[PDB]
Ligand SMILES: Nc1ncnc2c1ncn2[C@@H]1O[C@H](CSCC[C@H](N)C(=O)O)[C@@H](O)[C@H]1O
């Protein structure tokens with residue numbers, strides 16, 4: 001039972017035309033709380049938790065795989081969170097969806113590592129996407145990155161440094177470094193069970 | 208008192224390094240690049256890198272004379288002539304080298320000084336980052352490896368805040384194949400129990 005008409009019925013959580021609201025996302029939520037976005041909201045357990053945890057922040061999740069954003073809309077439907085919208089769009093469309101400074105933070109969780117050299121350009125921490133984040137947040141923004149992948153994290157650290165961003169937080173073992181209020185992602189729960197360390201970085205723009 | 212073998216081996220352990228500021232090419236006899244290690248220890252590292260790379264001039268610094276003696280002995284057993292050693296504190300680096308005279312600085316398993324009041328004693332603190340810039344110029348780099356998650360985590364932020372560019376970073380050095388890697392004494396000990404060894408390379412922006 002493949003369900004795509006499901007996303008049309010819940011068009012109040014899954015905005016089927018997000019480009020229309022560029023510059024006007026404050027009207028979409030009804031308040032001017034800061035908008036934080038997650039670029040890879042696979043299954044929406046994280047975004048839902050951060051919403052319930054922080055009612056005074058407006059969360060917008062982005063997902064490319066429609067097979068999995070469906071699960072995300074269901075978690076937002078169950079959590080009854082009213083400060084969560086979801087976009088089934090590609091990260092390259094960020095500048096068509098948000099005006100500079102409309103976004104205040106970007107959350108990156110367990111993104112695809114694309115280990116091969118030819119696929120650096122597809123990594124969500126590559127300078128192309130680093131630019132897209134600068135273009136929607138301005139220089140008053142930050143990136144909150146967590147991943148299990150040593151390769152992707154190692155690369156991301158260099159990529160942040162090369163782009164000129166300031167490292168304000170870095171953990172090389174998140175579940176042994178006490179972080180108050182940490183919402184685990186689906187991928188975080190599984191690789192945590194595996195006893196593998198989870199890396200976390202906070203990176204922000206210089207001003 | 209006494210018990211110093213350093214006077215007899217004054218050709219490896221330079222007992223007056225401030226005299227040679229600006230003139231270290233005369234101390235070696237060539238213009239091979241000068242790499243320095245801060246916090247040498249028993250000298251296993253500096254000796255290995257010297258024998259491995261005869262075309263680089265290595266100068267190791269150590270504060271405790273009890274342990275630099277072991278370092279001069281390892282340099283004595285190896286036949287490397289491109290190793291000098293200084294029994295001095297990292298602060299006097301600007302009294303020993305002219306800007307641009309040093310090309311790289313090696314930091315291995317430095318003291319972490321975990322509590323906040325002793326941040327200023329850490330060898331990756333902005334004070335020392337300046338001292339390294341002042342002896343290397345903008346053409347220098349730092350090659351840091353340590354077992355300490357705390358110190359590495361801090362150092363990465365410290366490098367970023369100071370404005371240095373991260374060109375290499377390993378969060379598991381013995382699973383990331385590094386070809387020219389010479390293990391330090393402390394590296395061998397913390398390698399036991401499989402603790403991960405972190406490594407970073409940072410260089411100045413231009
Ligand atoms: N360019 C892009 N735009 C949007 N989503 C993307 C993307 N590239 C990858 N993704 C999505 O990002 C997710 C990363 S894997 C799942 C991560 C999730 N935070 C978790 O921890 O469970 C995948 O669902 C993938 O399809």
Ligand SMILES: Nc1ncnc2c1ncn2[C@@H]1O[C@H](CSCC[C@H](N)C(=O)O)[C@@H](O)[C@H]1O
Nearest residue numbers: 246247248270296297315316318391392393
């Ligand atoms: N400011 C300073 N100047 C010089 N040496 C210092 C120093 N602070 C600490 N040290 C020395 O640096 C060493 C740190 S322990 C590391 C030993 C060696 N690098 C190894 O990896 O095996 C100790 O010998 C300590 O006494």
